[PDB]
Each structure stands twice: as C-alpha cells, then as structure tokens.
Design a binder for these strands. Structure first.
Ligand SMILES: [Zn+2]
Ligand SMILES: [Zn+2]
Lengths: 129, 147, 42, 33, 81, 19, 28, 150, 25, 184, 63
RNA sequence: AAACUAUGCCGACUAGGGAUCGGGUGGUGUUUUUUUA
C-alpha cells in the first residue's frame, strides 16, 4: 500500500520543493525520518520543522527555503565497505564534494563524510545533493 | 538574533544583556533610523515584537496569520515600518497602533523575502521568493513596477 | 451445465502450513518433521 | 505544443529511480563492488 | 481559503476544515443533557445517537436516529454538556 | 435484537437443548 | 456577498485588519 | 481502495486528544462494568455494547472509561465469543446469501457477491488462525454454517 | 514571576509611545 | 493523627502538613469522611527560579483519583494554610527495566510503566485540573530542540500564574526542558 | 588552454567525469580551462534545472 | 455479422474554477402546516 514512510516523506519533500512551496506537511513520522531530516537541516538543505502529535503517528511540518536540489532513499539497504563508500559517492552524486551520502552504522545514522572522520561505515539509506 | 536576542557589545566578549518575549527563536532584527534606542524583530511564532533599549525590555508583540521575513523602518518618519510577510504581502505598520496596518501592498504571487525603503522615505522595494522585484510608492498600495 | 454454487477458493501456502500445524513449530522441530514427511513419502 | 518538454539533465547514474526510491540491482552492486 | 499556515491556522480555518483533515483530527459530536418531561429526569445522550433513547423511569422516547445528528422529539428540554 | 447464539455460554446451552 | 445577504451579524473585517491574529498589550 | 468496491471513501469516528473522561462524567467505573455485563447476558455483541453505552449513559468510550477494551472486560468476566464478531457476521451473511440463492437459483449478481464474501471470509479466518486465536483445524463449510447458525 | 514582568513591559510601552509622539509632532 | 496519615515516613514538614489535613477535617463539615480513607506516601518541597516555592504530593493511584475528584477546594484551603505557595499532587509510579541479553526470569515490562508513559502521567497530572491539547517539538538548525505543551483555556486566569512553577517543578522531577503555551 | 562550451559541461556532468582530472588523463598534461562570460550566461539562462552545473562551473580553479 | 474517419503526449501531480449527483452540518427567510400523522 503506502510504499514506505521513508520513501513517501522524502518524496513529498522533493515534490513540494520543486513545485515551489515554502513549507510542507508529512504524515507519518519516524525515528528514522526525524534523524534524516536533522542531518539535512544540519547541512543546510532545509530550514526548520515542527513535529506534531496526535498519538496515531507524528505529523511533521518542514519549512524549506530553496537550497534542496534532490534528496532520496535507496531501496536495497545493502552493505558497503570504505573504498566502496568512496566509489559509491563518486558514482551517485553529481560530483565529488557536491552533496552527501547518508548511512546507518552501528555507531548511528550520519553522513558519509563525518562517518569517515569517525572511521566507520555500514549500510546506505539515501543521498542528498 | 538566535535562540534569544542577545544585545552584544564590541568590547565585551560575553552577551551584554539578553532579551526575549517567549522562548521561541527570533529570525530577524532591525534597529531604526531615528530613535536609535528602539529595536524591532520578528520570530518564528509569526510575531513582530518591538523592544526598547534605553528601557531595555520588549515592549509589544503582535501575532499575525503568517510569519514575517524581514522588516525595515522609514528613515524619514521614525515610527512606521514595513514587514515583508510570507502571505505574499508587504504590510505597512505604524508603531503605536499595532491593531491596524497602515497599508498592505498586495501583488506578488509567492512569499516576500526582503523589503526596504528608499532613503527618501517614499518608496519601497520588495524582493520575493517568486523571481521578481516590486517597487511601491507608499501612498497607493499596488505594485508600481516589476523587475 | 450451469451451477449456481461457486467453487471454493483455492487455499494458500500459509493456509497449508497452518493446516500441517508446522507454522507453530520451532526451527529444529519443523526441519526434523519435514525430514520425517519426506522419509515417509519416500 | 508539439515540442517535447525539455527534460532535466539526468544525473544520479546507478539504477532505477521509482516510487520506493532508488533501487540498485545486484548486478550493479557486483559491478561496482 | 487562499493561503494559510500549516502550523498556526485560524479559529475559522479550524472550524471550517473537515473533521479528519484538520491539523489534529478530532470529534464533531457532543452530548445533550436532557430532562425527560414524563418524570422531569436528567439524562445524557450522545449528540449523534443512533437509538430511540428512552428514559429509565418514564418509558418515553427522547431522540430518534435520523442520519447524522440524533433528532430529538418534541418537548424534551436540553442543554449541551 | 440480541444475537441468540453469539456467546460461549449461549452455545453451551445450545448443546444442552440439542441433547 | 452571499454569506452576507443571508447571515445577520457578520462584521466587515477591514482588509487592514484581516491578517492580524493578536496583540498582547492592549488599548482602550 | 475500500476493497472489492472501487470507491475511495473515508467515513468514521475520530478520537479527541485527551486520554481521560470529561470531568462532568460522574458514573461508577464498576457501575458501567455491571451494565456491560448485564447487556452481554442479555445477548448483545461488543460493538452494540459500546453503542448503547455511549448513547444512553454519556460514557464517552469504554477503552478510556475503564482500563480495558470491552471484550477484555468480557474475557475477565468469562464472556469471550467462540469466533470474532466480524467473522460471525460474515458467517451470517454467507448463510443468508446461500439460502437466498438456493430458493432463487438465477441471481448471478448474488453468485458474484458470494464469491467476494467467501474470499474475504477466508482471509479473516487465515488471520485468526495466524494469531491462533481460532483453532488451527477450523474450517469454513456450509456444514459449519448450518450447524453454527441453526 | 511573569505578571510583574508583563506590567513592567506595558509601562515601557507607554514611555516609548510618548517619545515617538514627539517625533510625530 | 500524623502516624495515621503518613505512610512509613515521619518527617517534620510531612507531619506539619498532615496536621494541616487534620485541621481540614476538624474545620470541615463533610471533608472529615470525604478524606478520612485517603492517605499519601510523601511530600516534597521545590523552590523556583522566580524565588517562589511549591510542593509535591506523592500518593498511590486510588487516593490520587480521590484527589482528582476533590482537589480544587483542598488546594484552596492548603494555600490559605501555607500562604505564598504552590501545590501539586503526583503519583509514585514504579519503573521497570528492560531485560538485557543476559537476563534471568523477568517479566516483559509494561508499556505503561515504561520510561515514557510514566513521564506523560507526570505531565498530565501536574497540569490538572486544566487539560492538555497538544505537544510540539521544534528542531532548530543548530541542533536545538524545544519541547512544548499546549494546554487549554478553561482555567485561564487562575493558571496563568502557575506556568513558571510548573516548568521549574517538571525540570526538578525529570531533568527535562518544557515550554508551556496556551492558544488564547 | 581549453575553452568550455555549455553543452560540453552538461555532457561531462551527465557522464560523471570531473573537468580538471578528466582533461588531465585525456591530454596527459595540465589543462587550464576557460569559461567565457557568454558560456556562463548561457548556463544561467538554461536556469533552474541546470543550477547543478552552474554550481559546478563557478569553480575557483576554472579560470 | 461486425467493421467503415475516429487520436488525447504520459505519471509517484499543485493550485483550482464554474456546473451537476449522493449523503452531512449551519444559517435563513418563503413554500409548506395547525394534538396528528
Ligand atoms: Zn421522566
Ligand atoms: Zn562571449
């Protein structure tokens, strides 16, 4: 039915910020959605956002300026080494220092650059550029 | 302007004095052109809050139907400003009576992300998230020219 | 010939495993019972 | 009208970009790793 | 109608939007306290009740279900609440 | 209105009346 | 226009006061 | 989808935010308990139990008025049903339609509907056996229909 | 406490209103 | 009746307030029998950053329900007893751990007694007699959250001067930061 | 010294070779690239869908 | 026996506009009608 919380929430952001709306509504929320969006706002791609509750599922209202270009989710959350981190970045993003790669490690959910600073790796959620 | 409006000083390495109405952020400051002791700021609870400094405290708060992105005072008149406001508008306020807007300039189609006054205290430029630029002559209140 | 009565729906694989009751069995019990079934069918 | 909608420049080059998001085939995983 | 914030809408926007598509889904029924006249009794009925609610003492009809809002019968005196 | 055979006790007395 | 030719006590919210939602300090 | 019928409708109850009763409620928790028990002894399904208790007595919703969902109350008081009420209603509907056909052997529309009903009833039975809340060797057949409705 | 803060702020507002009224003049 | 009011806890402030309860009884026509079967476990004092002071009343659940029934007037008279104070009832609800990978014969801990739902009961019970209608949490760019609690407006005036004490006491009891708001 | 045309930049991005290193491993010497104001203008004119390549071309090692 | 001049770029889709069909709420005056249906 509903394909995935991650897919649909991220795709809602993408649609609205290409159509031209200042702030979007998303339902539901998730630990993972929240963590992802925190990474995005940390790097600048969006602005700031509310989490609304009704006990059924958290809604989220995200004010985004215009800085996003695209950002999304990988379906097979496969496994990647460190040399493969580098090759995967260069092979996905529009260029080398352009964007970030977003991962789940046993250490936590986090971008590929500060992942490498911690000298950790793991599986791959998505990508921002 | 951050979590709470800190009034800094150049010499003192620490926030000289903190100010805030309610513990929301504050997204825009601007002082005024005369009465150099009066401050105005807008914050993410859709509010315009005026502050004094020679009295050193917030003085008034208005909550609108949608946030204001940036405000500016008119260097001829010292107590009217315009507030460029995401509901696709430029709202012209007088200070004392914040129960009514002196004007409302109304001809963009997306949010208005900055605004300013021709230092001849007559003319307004409004730049919008929609890729244009208005000028308004402050006595009418529609768009006077679009770049 | 016309039948007014519709034929029953063809049961599903999970239905079949519950019918065997194997679904409620643990890993080792299920594998050994599957071995028993194959051995007796053989 | 009869012109074609000027297509965006097509960037993220691994696999299929669809409803669930980006699917990278196991062929592709093995190809670049 | 034209443009309104996702987060801080109006009183009008709330009480005009639907009951599931408001910012926090909520109910639109309520409760009628009513005195039945046959005994001048006090009883509570669901504002949208779907049964011919009848007071315990006076076996008298209070409201007959009519689509959405439970429709009262003549001369049964209510408040809300 | 009542469903005459819904509850477990109901079906027990149904067996009773069958016997 | 329709809401007004039918409804009784509808105020004319002036368009220099449509978009305000509340002051804190007050007047007379 | 609103399955087997293509209308995309939505129509139901909401729930207020508060996890309590409104203060103006002043009935005994135990009192509503015996009213539940008495209506159950009279012979009403849990759905109708809830309906009566939220129409007649200002009991907003039993899940919050008491500590448990109402058939958890009925299990505490020994009155769980043999089959879930929705499955029971489906059984009743299937019996109805089958006997309808048998007297009336040409209602092909009804034949179609009976296909739909048997499909859904198989689905629900499978779910209940997955929970094992219903017996695993349990089946649907016209024999169960007759011997359980009559 | 909050309410004395509130009243302090109102007094401030009166002061600022006076000053700005002379700038009106 | 100080020993008849305490629950294995002789402390001087507790004895003073239990004597206050005895005064409630002996000056009260019906509250004698209204509260006589009602006891508590403990009382605690908390000062506020504003310089004022407040008190918390840890009670088991059933007598807490009794206070939910009969609270407002009791708070009135206890305030008149100890002028210049704030007062709150609370429930001592136990917490239960999560069994680890190497754990003995333990029970699957309650969703209600889990770390969250308890704190939610502290929220709602603290806020009582007025009710809660929202909970927001903002995430500003600098990784700066704000938790926020949307109350109601039925009790507006008598509560508008409780909010600071509320914030402080909840900080003292949980180490959390919460901001209270009322949509007027 | 190598002049860049808007279309060459679009295809370079679209096939993921970075300007400087790519030209280096093709020509096998250094390759100072040159964008003219006209090329930059055409990129910007193409506009929002091409904002990607615009950010790549505003590069402090592209003379 | 049919067939025999028909053809609109498409989709995870945004704001919609009039007119209509099926319920529902609210106002509100006309038509209605009044202890009987
Ligand atoms: Zn009566
Ligand atoms: Zn040129």
């Amino acid at each position: 039915t509903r394909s995935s919380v991650l897919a649909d929430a991220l795709n809602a952001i993408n649609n609205a910020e290409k159509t031209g709306k200042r702030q979007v509504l998303i339902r539901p929320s998730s630990k993972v959605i929240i963590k992802f969006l925190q990474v995005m706002q940390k790097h600048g791609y969006i602005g700031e956002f509310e989490y609304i509750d009704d006990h059924r599922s958290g809604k989220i209202v995200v004010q985004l300026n215009g800085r996003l270009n695209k950002c999304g989710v990988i379906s097979p959350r496969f496994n990647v080494k460190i040399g493969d981190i580098e090759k995967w970045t260069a092979n996905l993003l529009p260029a080398r220092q352009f964007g970030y790669v977003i991962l789940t490690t046993s250490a936590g959910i986090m971008d590929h650059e500060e992942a490498r600073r911690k000298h950790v790796s793991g599986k791959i959620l998505g990508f921002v550029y | 302007g951050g979590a709470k409006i800190h009034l800094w000083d150049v010499n003192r390495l620490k926030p000289v004095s903190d100010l805030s109405w309610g513990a929301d952020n504050i997204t825009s400051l601007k002082f005024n052109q005369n009465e150099t002791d009066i401050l105005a700021s807008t914050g993410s609870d859709n509010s315009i809050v005026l502050y004094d400094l020679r009295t050193n405290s917030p003085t008034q708060k208005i909550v609108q139907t949608m946030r204001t992105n940036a405000i500016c005072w008119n260097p001829m008149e010292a107590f009217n400003f315009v507030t460029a406001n995401e509901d696709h508008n430029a709202y012209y306020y007088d200070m004392r009576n914040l129960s009514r807007s002196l004007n409302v300039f109304k001809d963009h189609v997306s949010a208005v992300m900055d605004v300013d006054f021709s230092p001849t205290g007559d003319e307004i430029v409004t730049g919008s998230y929609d890729k244009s630029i208005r000028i308004y002559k402050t006595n009418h209140g529609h768009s006077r020219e679009i770049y | 010939v016309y039948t007014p009565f519709p034929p029953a729906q063809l049961p599903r694989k999970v239905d079949l495993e519950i019918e065997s009751g194997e679904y409620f069995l643990s890993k080792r019990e299920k594998q050994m019972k599957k071995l028993n079934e194959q051995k007796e069918k053989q | 009208k009869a012109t074609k909608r000027e297509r965006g420049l097509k960037i993220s080059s691994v696999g299929r970009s669809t409803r669930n998001g980006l699917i990278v085939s196991k062929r592709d995983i093995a190809r670049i790793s | 109608v034209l443009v309104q914030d996702l987060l801080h809408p109006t009183a009008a926007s709330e009480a005009r939007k639907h009951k599931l598509k408001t910012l926090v889904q909520g109910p639109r029924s309520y409760f009628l306290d009513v005195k039945c006249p046959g005994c001048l009794n006090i009883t509570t009925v669901f504002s949208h009740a779907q049964t011919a609610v009848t007071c315990e003492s006076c076996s008298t009809i209070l409201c007959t279900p009519t689509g959405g809002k439970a429709k009262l019968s003549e001369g049964t005196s209510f408040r809300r609440k | 209105k009542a469903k005459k055979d819904f509850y477990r006790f109901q079906v027990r007395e149904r067996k009773k009346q069958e016997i | 226009a329709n809401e007004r030719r039918t409804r009784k006590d509808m105020p004319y919210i002036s368009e220099r006061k449509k978009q305000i939602v509340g002051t804190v300090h007050k007047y007379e | 989808g609103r399955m087997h019928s293509a209308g995309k409708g939505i129509s139901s109850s909401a729930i207020p935010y508060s996890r309590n009763a409104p203060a103006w409620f002043k009935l005994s928790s135990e009192s509503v308990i015996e009213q539940i028990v008495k209506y159950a002894r009279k012979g009403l399904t849990p759905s109708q139990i809830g309906v009566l208790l939220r129409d007649a007595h200002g009991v907003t919703q039993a899940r919050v008025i008491t500590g448990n969902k109402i058939m958890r109350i009925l299990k505490s008081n020994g009155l769980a049903p043999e089959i879930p009420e929705d499955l029971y209603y489906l059984i009743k509907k299937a019996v109805s339609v089958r006997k309808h056909l048998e007297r009336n052997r040409k209602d092909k529309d009804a034949k179609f509907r009976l296909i739909l009903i048997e499909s859904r009833i198989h689905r629900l039975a499978r779910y209940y056996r997955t929970v094992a809340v219903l017996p695993p060797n349990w089946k649907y057949e016209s024999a169960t229909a007759s011997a359980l409705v009559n | 406490q909050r309410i004395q803060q509130r009243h302090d702020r109102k007094a401030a507002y009166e002061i600022s209103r006076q000053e700005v009224s002379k700038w009106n003049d | 009746p100080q020993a008849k009011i305490l629950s294995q806890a002789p402390t001087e402030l507790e004895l003073q307030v239990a004597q206050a309860f005895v005064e409630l009884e002996n000056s009260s026509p019906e509250l004698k029998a209204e509260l006589r079967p009602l006891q508590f476990k403990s009382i605690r004092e908390i000062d506020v950053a504003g310089g004022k002071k407040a008190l918390a009343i840890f009670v088991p659940v059933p007598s807490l329900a009794g206070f939910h029934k009969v609270q407002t007037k009791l708070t009135r008279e206890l305030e008149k007893k100890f002028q210049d104070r704030h007062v709150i009832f609370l429930a001592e609800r136990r917490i239960l751990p999560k069994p680890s990978r190497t754990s003995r014969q333990v029970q699957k801990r309650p969703r209600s007694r889990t770390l969250t739902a308890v704190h939610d009961k502290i929220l709602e019970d603290l806020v009582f007699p007025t009710e809660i209608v929202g909970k927001r949490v903002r995430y500003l760019v600098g990784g700066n959250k704000i938790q926020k609690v949307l109350l109601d407006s039925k009790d507006v005036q008598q509560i508008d001067y409780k909010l600071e004490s509320f914030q402080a006491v909840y900080n003292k009891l949980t180490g959390k930061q919460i901001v209270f708001e009322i949509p007027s | 010294q190598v002049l860049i045309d808007t279309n060459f930049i679009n295809f370079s991005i679209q096939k993921k070779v970075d300007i400087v290193r790519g030209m280096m491993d093709c020509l096998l010497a250094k390759c100072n690239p040159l964008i003219t104001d006209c090329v930059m203008a055409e990129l910007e004119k193409l506009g929002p869908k091409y904002r990607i390549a615009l950010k790549l071309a505003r590069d402090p090692r592209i003379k």
